[PDB]
Every structure is written in structure tokens, then in C-alpha cells.
Ligand binder design. Structure first.
Ligand SMILES: CCCCCCCCCCC(=O)OC[C@H](COP(=O)(O)OC[C@H](O)COP(=O)(O)OC[C@@H](COC(=O)CC)OC(=O)CCC)OC(=O)CCCCCCCC
Ligand SMILES: CCCCCCCCCCCCCCCCCC(=O)OC[C@H](COP(=O)(O)OCCN)OC(=O)CCCCCCCCCCCCC
Ligand code: HEM
Ligand code: HEM
Ligand code: HEM
Ligand SMILES: COc1c(O)c(C)c(C/C=C(\C)CC/C=C(\C)CC/C=C(\C)CC/C=C(\C)CC/C=C(\C)CCC=C(C)C)c(O)c1OC
Ligand SMILES: CCCCCCCCCCCCCCCCCC(=O)O[C@H](COC(=O)CCCCCC)COP(=O)(O)OCCN
Ligand SMILES: CO/C=C(/C(=O)OC)c1ccccc1Oc1cc(Oc2ccccc2C#N)ncn1
Lengths: 54, 74, 248, 93, 385
């Protein structure tokens, strides 16, 4: 049962909150940076360099 | 292309409110003009300005021009 | 004090970096540097800005190398001990127009023009005050005000008498991207460039703040649920009193 | 070590209150209760009387001090204008 | 027994944050003391990492702080958390002391606990004064000039205490170098006073918002008040993060981004917001020697409250007259902070003199008179005679 497969065995209840937090860092940082740059499109230096190529 | 801030300040100085405040600065400007042709150059310790009348007109033009100037600029 | 001794209040403009999710406009930063080189730099220094910080923000890497190579810097002495000069590199800081403070006052009638690296954060009003000062010179002062010779009238300066004259006029600068260079456009661009000079971390600080607020908001809402679960046995506890029998 | 001085609190088993007799208490496990039964019947009526049976001890001193500060700020503004120039030499004596 | 009770170092941990008996009815105002412990750790840890990059010479001090903001990796995070964290430290401390006034926590048998807290408040004020000098901005130089010149009005020793505090003839290079070394030390003295503060609290325990004995119903600290403490820790960190990342210069002065110049006086010399009420008390006495005595008496008058409270009931919960005059004292403190940021002008001069009188009359006149009247009204409203 899904208590005893996820939160009973506290050799990995300390473990899964320590390993789920590792993959959490890269997915969270990719999602916010993509939202933050799309909200500010046309204003970044990479949007400027693409037509100051002249 | 002329200056965009000069166009907006020209327009709001000819509203119904802008004509009243431009007129109030003009009456103090002649009151200093009569005052500076008597004995009283270095006298009197209390000679008058029109800074307060000038500040009232500039405060009206600033609350009208500022929320709409940056839409007209690149 | 009177309103003239405090200065006229600067209004609020719709700057495109105002707001918790906004970055700088980097095309306005690039045009703002051109107004600095052609107008401001004759009398103002920018001492806290290094050449390398412009790469990837407003110019490419070989553009900044050519800009720094038009100035000469002090070098280590030769084998006999005589001093030398060398052209600039990306490690150097942007040089100013005067050798010392006494030469700066002698060229500006005794007044000292301040360094502009922190001027946006060092004045009350911020970007709104710098923009209103540059575009706020009247053609003549109000009636009665007698300025001393060598000074000019500006109502946003405290006291009203400032030692710098009006410097921005229509079409004094030819832009690279083809923007019309009016007085209002050039004052807007150089204020944006000076705000980046004071706050270079600005675009990174707002991105890191969005991750921190989202994580700390989730931990706050989860702790309210967990506290209310673990306190429910105490909050619904009931008591009953039956008076004991005497003689004991 | 040496024994300490006399206090007004003890520990578990010898806490130091009066003797209790005749009181029964009852409680139910939190695992057998409804999850989160508060935002309503507490924002309905409970979190309005808890401060509006107390609001008059706060807002009467707040209204006295806000009236005093606002009245003094308008008088300083009058004294440094053009119309209040004659009173300004009188009260700086 | 268990190992948490038999070990020499873990039994101190167990009797303080695990098994300590708390009254069951304390509210969220009793959480401010543990937030002050988190604030002191934040100020110490961000202080060490900035000190690895700081130079205390008067020619180098302003540019060292600009070097931290620009060149150090995440250096702007270290400074902004440090400067804004000092303002959050004073706000939590003001609410912690006002909780003690309202509920009568100063009364017997907790007088030693209240007296140690007054020493902590004095050392925190001196700490924030010395760190503000280390920036050497324009407000840093002239604020140190005004405060250190007050001590020359002391009779027969005054002109030699000041030059011993300057190391010279004015605020100069030996002044800034000795102020940074004192700024490192005093937070470690504060940490030792906090340990003496927690020893006196362990003897008697905490009070409760009803004012009466708590020995009849106690619950242990662990998993009840540990999880109640987590709610206010996360709310504190969220509001602090909104200031550090989104509005980092709101609680400061823009004149402190100009380097210190001993030849140019600023148009207005204003302290930080948490020292503004004590600045207005000083400017309300025209004589210079009596003004600095009254300024230090505003902190030391907190020690007279165990002797001027005459009530037989602890706290303000069931007293309507003491409730009214408590909030008169709170809004008088806010008005004194606002007067301290104004110019010396009519009518702010007389307003500051009346508000200074109301501050001292609360501790010495209002509290003993009102609490005597409330003793008699409780009696004659019940006794049939
Ligand atoms: C400055 C940076 C520090 C940041 C953290 C400091 C927090 C200071 C706040 C002042 C304080 O500590 O006293 C709070 C007091 C309420 O005390 P009480 O025990 O009687 O209320 C228990 C409640 O009924 C159940 O509260 P419960 O535990 O059921 O839910 C928690 C609640 C949030 O709780 C908190 O955050 C406490 C601060 O969650 C929700 O609201 C659910 C919806 C999201 O409030 C009052 O007595 C009067 C209310 C106004 C006080 C503001 C005065 C500030 C000067
Ligand atoms: C020398 C040092 C001097 C220190 C002086 C400190 C002055 C700083 C101002 C701190 C404000 C803190 C005021 C509240 C102090 C907490 C203690 C308290 O007043 O009790 C909470 C009060 C009682 O509520 P209850 O009646 O429901 O509970 C009774 C117990 N059963 O419930 C309430 O009424 C809470 C209402 C709080 C409103 C207070 C507004 C304060 C505004 C200050 C703004 C300052 C920034 C501008
Ligand atoms: C677009 C160009 C320029 C900009 C944006 C600029 C910016 C500034 C700013 C922000 C100030 C400070 C005002 C204050 O204290 O509030 C200042 C002062 C001053 N500037 Fe300029 N400047 C420019 C060009 C010049 C030029 C071309 C000169 C001289 C020929 C000059 C000479 C001065 C002087 C003398 C002062 C000091 C004035 C005083 O303290 O009364 N500046 N400038
Ligand atoms: C209770 C502890 C402390 C308090 C209340 C405190 C307060 C302050 C304040 C108010 C400033 C001026 C900040 C500004 O406006 O820029 C400052 C600066 C500074 N403090 Fe602290 N401080 C504390 C602990 C420490 C410690 C323990 C250290 C060093 C080990 C330290 C190192 C510094 C440094 C290097 C500066 C200058 C850099 C800066 O301006 O931020 N501080 N401190
Ligand atoms: C760094 C500074 C301080 C720390 C870490 C601290 C810590 C604490 C803690 C953890 C408590 C117990 C929990 C609570 O009642 O909130 C407490 C209680 C208390 N503190 Fe502080 N405190 C500090 C400063 C002060 C100051 C400045 C004062 C008064 C001038 C003070 C006076 C008291 C009193 C009277 C109590 C007992 C409250 C009661 O039992 O109802 N403390 N302190
Ligand atoms: C009534 O019941 C209660 C109660 O209600 C509460 C709340 C508490 C709460 C207890 C606290 C809040 C504890 C108080 C907090 C302190 C004493 C903090 C003391 C501060 C320090 C020890 C600072 C030390 C910091 C350092 C050493 C960091 C140093 C930095 C380094 C080493 C940088 C690393 C260097 C390199 C090169 C990497 C009780 O104990 C208690 O029982 C009595
Ligand atoms: C200056 C303020 C001082 C405040 C003191 C507060 C106490 C801080 C301690 C914080 C908790 C530390 C946990 C200690 C772990 C248990 C102790 C222990 O293991 O002792 C011993 C082993 O000896 C050691 O190796 C000591 C380790 C040094 C610890 C230095 C940090 C356990 O064996 P023992 O059976 O003797 O324990 C019973 C003791 N009465
Ligand atoms: C170095 O300047 C420090 C200042 C500051 O605010 O530090 C945080 C400061 C700036 C401008 C003007 C004054 C300043 O300092 C101070 C210092 C101060 O100290 C006291 C506070 C309470 C009781 C006595 C004193 C003293 N002395 N009370 C008020 N302002």
C-alpha cells in the first residue's frame, strides 16, 4: 500500500526527500528561466544582436 | 520629427484648466514689472517672485504629460 | 522650508524596467552609451565601470576592444626606470576627462561635476529626477528671480540655481539604428544607461527573486496545514467536573 | 551539585499546583477527524468579533494622534508659502 | 532512562526545546523570541563572509563595499540581506518588548529576566551605530560627528573622552579602523547575554495571556510549539525575501551612496528609522548636557516598571483603562519617530516637547495612578457595604 511504499521505510524517507530534491533543482530552474525570457522578449541582448548584425 | 515633450506641453497649456493657470502667472509677471522701476532697487528687503505661480502651472502639466509620453518614444 | 529651496517634485514615468518581472531594454542601453561618449564625457567621469562589463550587455567582444584601444594608460617602467605608456585593454576602467579636482573646477568656473557611476541611487527620485532635470530648463526664469552670473535656472534643482547649462538639443547625435534623436529620446536613453551603471545585477536579481518567493510561499502554506493537523486533538478536548464527597 | 533555591515551577510529576480531584477529560485522535474545518465558521463570525470588541481601544488613540499630526503639517505648509509670510516673522521671535 | 536525558550535553538540549513544559494557551505573540535567535544567526553569518573582502582604511572603505556589490560572486545578496536584516531585527525586538509591557512579563518573579533584556537592547543599538560608520558614506561621517560631539559637554572629563574616542582631532582614519574592530566583537557579547537570558527563563518558565498560573495544564515543546514556530519562521523569511530582491533600498537613505566629505555638510542629517524616536527626544532639550542625559534616560526608565505598577493583577487583559493608555503610548512612539525626521521648524519643536513629556509620564505618573484606581473599582463593585 502506497503509505508503506513511499513514507514508511525511513531509510529512504530521509532518502527520497534528499534524492527528489536533486532532480527538482534542474526542472524548476529550466521552467522559470524559459518563462522569464519569454515575458521579456525583444529586450534581451540576444534579441538585439540578431538585428545589429547589419 | 520635432520634440514629443514640447508637443504635449503645448496641447495641455490650451485646455480649460491650462488657460486659467497660464493667466494667473501672467498677472504676477506684470506686478513685478511695475515694481522694478521705482526707488526700490536695493531697498525694501521683501521683493516678490512668481515662483509659486510658476510651480502651480508646472505641477498641472506634469500630471497630464507623464503617464502618456513614453508611448510616443522608441 | 519653501518649495523653491526643496525643489519641484518629479513626476512618475512609465519606465519599461519598472515592475517585478521586467528587465532592462538593452537597445536603449546601447543608444545611451553613444549619448555619453558624444555629450556627457567632456566633463563627467565614469570611474567604477570596467570595459569588460559592457560585453554581452550592449556591445560585442571586438567592439569593446576597439573602444578601449583609443586611450592610453600608465605602464611599468623600462629597464632604466623611465615611465612608459600603453593602449587600453578590457581589464582597465573607463577614463575621465580631468587629471585632478583642481583642473576640473578650473574648467567649470569653480564647480565640480560629480562622478555618474552611482547617480541614480544617490538622489531622491531615481530615474524620474535625472530625466526631469535634463528636459526641464525653461527659456527664461520666472519674474523676480535674479541668478548670479555663471549659473542657470532649473526648477527641479534644490534652490533653483544650477551650475550646468542645457546641453541637449534636437538632432545633435546620429544614431546607428535610425532612431530620431529628439531631446526627449536622448534623455530617456542616457538615463537607462546610467541605471545599468548603478545596478548591473538588476536582471539577475529579479530572476533569482522569483525562484525564492515561489519556494518560500509553498513552505508557508504547507506549514499551516501541518500545524492545524497536529493541534486538532488539543483544540477539541472536553472537561467535566463532578464535586468529590467530603470527609477525607 | 548543591540544591537550588525555591521557585514557583517544577517538572513533570511535581509541577507545583494545587491537588486535583473530580475532573475528567476526553480527546479524539487527529487521524480520525475531518481535515481542515475552519476557514468557514471562523471567517464568518469568529474573526470579526475578536477585534471589533477591541477596536475602540485602538482607534480612539489612533484618531487623536492622526488628527494632531495632520493639523500641524498643514500649519507648517501655510507658514512657508507666500500668504503666511507675515505670520512667519512673528512666531520665529 | 533515555539517552537524551542522561548525556551531559543532550540534557541541556532536552530540557530547553524538547521536554520543557509550556502553558497551553499562549498565542502567536510568544513566537517573537525565537525569531530574534534566527536574526542574530543571520547577522553573524553574513557578517563573516563580507569581512573577508572588506578594508577599513578611510581611503578604501567606501570602494570596498562597492567591490562587494560588483565583483564578489553573489556579493549583492550578502550586503542586501545584511542591511535589510538589521531593520528586521529591530522590528521584531520592538514587538517583543511591547508584548512584555502588555502582559506584565516584567513583574515578579521575572525581574532578572527583564533586566538582562534591557542590557541586550543597549548593546544592539551600539552595534548598529558602529556598522553604519563602516560604510563611510556621507550620512556615515556626519552622523558620527554629531553623536561623538555630545560627550564633550560632560564636566571636567568631556574634552578628553572625545579625543580618546576619535584617536585624534576629528572623525578620521583611526576612528574608522577602531570602529570596525569594535563592530566585530559586540555581537559575541550579545550572544553571551542571550545564554544568560535563557537561564533565567528556565527557572520560572513563561507567562500566559490570562495572567494567572500555568502549573495546572502544560504540554511539552516538541511537535506542538516546534511546528507552531515553523509558521512564523517561513512568513518572516518570505517578507524578508521580498525586500532583499524586489525593493532593496526602500529602508535606507540615498545620501549614503555619496562618499564621505568632511568639507560639505548635507542638507539634512537623518538616522535610520529605528533610531528616530531617540533622536527627537535629544533635540527637544535646548541645553546640551541635559539633552544627552535625557537621551540615555529614555532607555534606563524601563527599569522602574517593576516598582511603579501597583496592580494586584498581572497583565492588561481585564483592565479597560490600562488598555486605553497602552495604545496612547504606542502611537506617541510613532509620532516621535516622525518628528525626528523633520526640520527644526514651527510647530514641530513644541510638538516634540509635548511628546517627550508623554513618554516619561507614562512610566512615572500614569501607570501608578491608573493601576491604583483599578484596584479600588474591582473592590467596591463586589463588596456589599
Ligand atoms: C515584521 C516581520 C516579521 C514577520 C512575522 C511576525 C508576525 C507578527 C504578527 C503579530 C503576532 O505575532 O500576533 C498575531 C496575532 C494573532 O494571534 P492569535 O494566536 O490570537 O491568532 C490565532 C488565529 O486565530 C489562528 O491561527 P491559525 O494557527 O489557526 O492559522 C495560522 C494563520 C497564520 O498565522 C500566522 O501567520 C501568525 C502570524 O494562517 C491563516 O491565516 C490561514 C489563512 C492563510 O494577531 C493579533 O493579535 C492582532 C492581529 C493584527 C496584528 C498585527 C500587528 C502588527 C504590528
Ligand atoms: C523603548 C522601546 C519602546 C518600545 C515601544 C514599542 C512600540 C512599537 C510598536 C509595536 C506595536 C506592538 C503593539 C502590540 C503589542 C502586542 C501585545 C498586545 O497588545 O496584545 C495583543 C492585543 C490583545 O488582543 P486580545 O484582547 O485578543 O488578547 C488578550 C489576551 N487574551 O491585540 C491587539 O490589539 C493587537 C493590535 C495591534 C495594533 C498595533 C498597531 C501598531 C502600529 C505600529 C506601526 C509602526 C510602524 C509605522
Ligand atoms: C547629457 C549630458 C549630461 C548629463 C546627463 C549630466 C548629468 C549631471 C547630473 C545628474 C548632475 C547632478 C545634478 C544634481 O546634483 O542633482 C550634473 C551636474 C553638473 N554637470 Fe552635468 N551632465 C551632463 C553634461 C554636462 C556638461 C556638458 C557639462 C559642462 C560643460 C556639465 C557640467 C556639470 C556641472 C558643473 C555640474 C554641477 C552643477 C552644480 O552642482 O550646481 N554636465 N550633471
Ligand atoms: C547583531 C549583529 C549585527 C548588526 C545589527 C549589524 C548591523 C550593521 C549595519 C546596520 C551595517 C550598515 C549596513 C548598511 O547600511 O550598508 C553593517 C555593516 C557591516 N557589518 Fe554588520 N551588523 C552585525 C553583525 C556583524 C558582524 C558579526 C560582522 C563581521 C564579522 C559584521 C560586518 C559588517 C561589515 C563588513 C559591514 C560593512 C558592509 C556593509 O555595509 O554591508 N556585521 N552592520
Ligand atoms: C537578541 C535578543 C533576545 C532574544 C534572543 C530573546 C529570547 C527570548 C525567548 C526565546 C523568550 C521565550 C519565548 C517568548 O516569550 O517569546 C523570551 C522571553 C522574554 N524576553 Fe526575550 N529575547 C531577546 C531580547 C529581549 C529584550 C530586548 C527584552 C526586554 C527589554 C526581553 C524580555 C523578555 C521577557 C520579559 C520575556 C518573558 C516573556 C513571558 O514570559 O511572557 N527579551 N526571550
Ligand atoms: C520557554 O521555552 C523556550 C522557548 O519558548 C524558546 C523559543 C526557546 C528558543 C531557543 C533559542 C531561540 C536559541 C537562542 C539563539 C542563540 C543562542 C543563537 C546564538 C548565536 C550563535 C551561536 C552564532 C554562532 C555562529 C557561527 C559560529 C557561524 C560562524 C561562521 C562561519 C564558521 C563561516 C564558515 C567559515 C568558512 C571558512 C567556510 C527555548 O530555549 C526555550 O526554553 C527555555
Ligand atoms: C558556550 C555555551 C555552551 C552551551 C552548551 C550547549 C550544548 C551544546 C551541545 C549540542 C549537542 C552536542 C551533541 C553531543 C553528542 C553526544 C555527546 C557525546 O557523544 O559524548 C560521549 C562521547 O564523548 C565524545 O566523544 C564527546 C563528543 C564531543 C562533542 C563536541 C560537540 C557519549 O558517551 P557517554 O556515555 O559518556 O555520554 C554520557 C555523558 N554524560
Ligand atoms: C554613524 O551614524 C549612525 C547613525 C545611525 O543611524 O546608525 C544606525 C546616525 C546617523 C545620523 C544621525 C545620527 C545617527 O546616530 C544616532 C545614534 C543614536 O544613539 C543613541 C540612541 C539611544 C540612546 C542614546 C544614543 C546615543 N548616543 N541615536 C540616534 N542617532
Amino acid at each position: 500500500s502506497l503509505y508503506k511504499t513511499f513514507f514508511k521505510r525511513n531509510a529512504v524517507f530521509v532518502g527520497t526527500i534528499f534524492a527528489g530534491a536533486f532532480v527538482f533543482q534542474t526542472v524548476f530552474d529550466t521552467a522559470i528561466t524559459s518563462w522569464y525570457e519569454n515575458h521579456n522578449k525583444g529586450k534581451l541582448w540576444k534579441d538585439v544582436k540578431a538585428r545589429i548584425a547589419a | 520629427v520635432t520634440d514629443q515633450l514640447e508637443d504635449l506641453r503645448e496641447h495641455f497649456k490650451n485646455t480649460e484648466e491650462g488657460k486659467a493657470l497660464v493667466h494667473h502667472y501672467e498677472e504676477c509677471a506684470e506686478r513685478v514689472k511695475i515694481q522694478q522701476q521705482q526707488p526700490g532697487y536695493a531697498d525694501l528687503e521683501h521683493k516678490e517672485d512668481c515662483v509659486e505661480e510658476f510651480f502651480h502651472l508646472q505641477h498641472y502639466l506634469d500630471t497630464a504629460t507623464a503617464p502618456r509620453l513614453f508611448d510616443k518614444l522608441k | 522650508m519653501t518649495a523653491a529651496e526643496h525643489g519641484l517634485h518629479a513626476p512618475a514615468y512609465a519606465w519599461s524596467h519598472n515592475g517585478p518581472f521586467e528587465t532592462f531594454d538593452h537597445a536603449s542601453i546601447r543608444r545611451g552609451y553613444q549619448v555619453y561618449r558624444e555629450v556627457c564625457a567632456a566633463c563627467h567621469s565614469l570611474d567604477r565601470v570596467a570595459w569588460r562589463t559592457l560585453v554581452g550587455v550592449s556591445h560585442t567582444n571586438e567592439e569593446v576592444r576597439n573602444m578601449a584601444e583609443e586611450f592610453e594608460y600608465d605602464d611599468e617602467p623600462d629597464e632604466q626606470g623611465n615611465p612608459k605608456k600603453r593602449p587600453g585593454k578590457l581589464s582597465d576602467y573607463i577614463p575621465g576627462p580631468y587629471p585632478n579636482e583642481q583642473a576640473a573646477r578650473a574648467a567649470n568656473q569653480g564647480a565640480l561635476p560629480p562622478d555618474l557611476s552611482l547617480i541614480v541611487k544617490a538622489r531622491h527620485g531615481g530615474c524620474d529626477y535625472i530625466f526631469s532635470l535634463l528636459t526641464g530648463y525653461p527659456d527664461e526664469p520666472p519674474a523676480g528671480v535674479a541668478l548670479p552670473p555663471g549659473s542657470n535656472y532649473n526648477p527641479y534643482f534644490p534652490g533653483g540655481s544650477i551650475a550646468m547649462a542645457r546641453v541637449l538639443f534636437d538632432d545633435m547625435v546620429e544614431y546607428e539604428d535610425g532612431t530620431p534623436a529628439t531631446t526627449s529620446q536622448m534623455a530617456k536613453d542616457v538615463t537607462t544607461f546610467l541605471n545599468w551603471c548603478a545596478e548591473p545585477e538588476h536582471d539577475e536579481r529579479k530572476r533569482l527573486g522569483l525562484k525564492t518567493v515561489i519556494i518560500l510561499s509553498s513552505l508557508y502554506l504547507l506549514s499551516i496545514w501541518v500545524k492545524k493537523f497536529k493541534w486538532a486533538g488539543i483544540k477539541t478536548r472536553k472537561f467535566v467536573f463532578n464535586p468529590p464527597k467530603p470527609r477525607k | 551539585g548543591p540544591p537550588s533555591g525555591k521557585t514557583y515551577m517544577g517538572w513533570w510529576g511535581h509541577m507545583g499546583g494545587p491537588k486535583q480531584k473530580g475532573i475528567t477529560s476526553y480527546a479524539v485522535s487527529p487521524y480520525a477527524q475531518k481535515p481542515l474545518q475552519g476557514i468557514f465558521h471562523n471567517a464568518v463570525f469568529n474573526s470579526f468579533r475578536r477585534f471589533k470588541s477591541q477596536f475602540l481601544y485602538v482607534l480612539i488613540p489612533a484618531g487623536i494622534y492622526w488628527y494632531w499630526w495632520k493639523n500641524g503639517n498643514e500649519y507648517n505648509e501655510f507658514l512657508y508659502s507666500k500668504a503666511g509670510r507675515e505670520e512667519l516673522e512673528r512666531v520665529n521671535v | 532512562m533515555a539517552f537524551r536525558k542522561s548525556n551531559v550535553y543532550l540534557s541541556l538540549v532536552n530540557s530547553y526545546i524538547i521536554d520543557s513544559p509550556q502553558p497551553s494557551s499562549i498565542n502567536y505573540w510568544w513566537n517573537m523570541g525565537s525569531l530574534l535567535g534566527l536574526c542574530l544567526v543571520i547577522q553573524i553569518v553574513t557578517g563573516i563572509f563580507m569581512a573577508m573582502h572588506y578594508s577599513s582604511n578611510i581611503e578604501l572603505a567606501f570602494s570596498s563595499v562597492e567591490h562587494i556589490m560588483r565583483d564578489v560572486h553573489n556579493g549583492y545578496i550578502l550586503r542586501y540581506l545584511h542591511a535589510n536584516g538589521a531593520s528586521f531585527f529591530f522590528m521584531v525586538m520592538f514587538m517583543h518588548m511591547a508584548k512584555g509591557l502588555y502582559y506584565g512579563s516584567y513583574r515578579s518573579p521575572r525581574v532578572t529576566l527583564w533586566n538582562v533584556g534591557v542590557i541586550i537592547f543597549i548593546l544592539t543599538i551600539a552595534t548598529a551605530f558602529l556598522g553604519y560608520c563602516c560604510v563611510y558614506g556621507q550620512m556615515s561621517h556626519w552622523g558620527a560627528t554629531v553623536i561623538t560631539n555630545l560627550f564633550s559637554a560632560i564636566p571636567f572629563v568631556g574634552n578628553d573622552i572625545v579625543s580618546w574616542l576619535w584617536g585624534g582631532f576629528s572623525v578620521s582614519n583611526p576612528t574608522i579602523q577602531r570602529f570596525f574592530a569594535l563592530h566585530y566583537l559586540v555581537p559575541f557579547i550579545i550572544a553571551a547575554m542571550v545564554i544568560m537570558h535563557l537561564m533565567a527563563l528556565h527557572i520560572h518558565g513563561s507567562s500566559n495571556p490570562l495572567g494567572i498560573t500555568g502549573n495546572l495544564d502544560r504540554i511539552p515543546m516538541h511537535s506542538y510549539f516546534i511546528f507552531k514556530d515553523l509558521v512564523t519562521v517561513f512568513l518572516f523569511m518570505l517578507i524578508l525575501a521580498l525586500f532583499v530582491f524586489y525593493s532593496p533600498n526602500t529602508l535606507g537613505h540615498p545620501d549614503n551612496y555619496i562618499p564621505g566629505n568632511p568639507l560639505v555638510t548635507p542638507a539634512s542629517i537623518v538616522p535610520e528609522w529605528y533610531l528616530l524616536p531617540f533622536y527627537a527626544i535629544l533635540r527637544s532639550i535646548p541645553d546640551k548636557l541635559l539633552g544627552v542625559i535625557t537621551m540615555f534616560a529614555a532607555i534606563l526608565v524601563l527599569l522602574v516598571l517593576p516598582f511603579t505598577d501597583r496592580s494586584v493583577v498581572r497583565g492588561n487583559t481585564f483592565k479597560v483603562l490600562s488598555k486605553f493608555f497602552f495604545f496612547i503610548f504606542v502611537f506617541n512612539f510613532v509620532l516621535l519617530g516622525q518628528i525626528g525626521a523633520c526640520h527644526v521648524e514651527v510647530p514641530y519643536v513644541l510638538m516634540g516637547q509635548i511628546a517627550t513629556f508623554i513618554y516619561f509620564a507614562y512610566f512615572l505618573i500614569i501607570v501608578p495612578v491608573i493601576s491604583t484606581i483599578e484596584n479600588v473599582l474591582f473592590y467596591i463593585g463586589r463588596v456589599n457595604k
